[PDB]
Write a protein that binds this ligand. Sequence first.
Ligand code: NA
Ligand code: NA
Ligand code: NA
Length: 327
Amino acid sequence: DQTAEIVIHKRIYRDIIDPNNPDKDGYKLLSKTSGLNGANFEVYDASSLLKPNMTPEAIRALVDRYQNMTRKQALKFARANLKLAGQGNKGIGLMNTKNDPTLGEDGISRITVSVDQQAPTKAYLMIEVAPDPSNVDLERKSSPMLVVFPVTDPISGNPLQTIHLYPKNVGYVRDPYFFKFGVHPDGTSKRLAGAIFAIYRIENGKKLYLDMSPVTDLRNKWVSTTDPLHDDRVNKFVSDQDGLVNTGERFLPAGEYFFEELQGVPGYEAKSRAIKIEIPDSWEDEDGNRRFVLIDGQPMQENFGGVVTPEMISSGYPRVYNYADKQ
Ligand code: NA
Ligand code: NA
Ligand code: NA
């Protein structure tokens, strides 16, 4: 008889459950192309979880019950008792997230399921399973999703023919910045404009530089370069009129990195100074205390979302001091 399409949009969000909503309170998407490929779902015919003439409240209670199970608990139930169903891209009831060339979007997986648009008699239980082997740090927080048809479109009054689901994956990133100051031999000092930095990390005893490639998943791309200053692949960060050297839209995950000065400010130019970035792997320690990014060992104030505020700019910290008086 009749079918509907369930479309999973698997994306990655940064922290600071309605699976049908692409907006998530307490979270924000990592980029416009932050879809997550390689995620896998099993989809079960869950019509036997329904009863005839059940109320909307009973359906919501059932949906909530399954959403509040862990994936492993829901799999224990579904694997034992239900059958795979729906035409997925990996098989009956089997979905893998891939790029959608039509929509131009990553993290997409579509499944066609038999539905009853006139009464709630068909339902599908969707549960994420292990991703394709290959982002170990990603928090895959999707829940068991019980999709009960029909889902009526309030605008149109029609049953929805496509259900869009936005299962939540959370990527941990932080946002380094610092201020470059210049110190005159007479003790005067100022914010420095025009310092050109790049970011590198160490891998196998060699430098890899943060490149200009679009972010995919939570991952930045890193390049070996012969000439980071003039290599267009290497992202440069320029100190502005407030002295601010800001990763800006760029973010970094946990680990150790370096801001490398590629062009010093005239008069404040000895191998190229490397300012250490130490990014802890969580916002908070065991006791809920903030864990700071360290810039050359200095704690760096930071807000969720990573935007450097006017108040942070006024503060001008952390600051790295460049001496005009060469000694
Ligand atoms: Na849940
Ligand atoms: Na940033
Ligand atoms: Na400082």
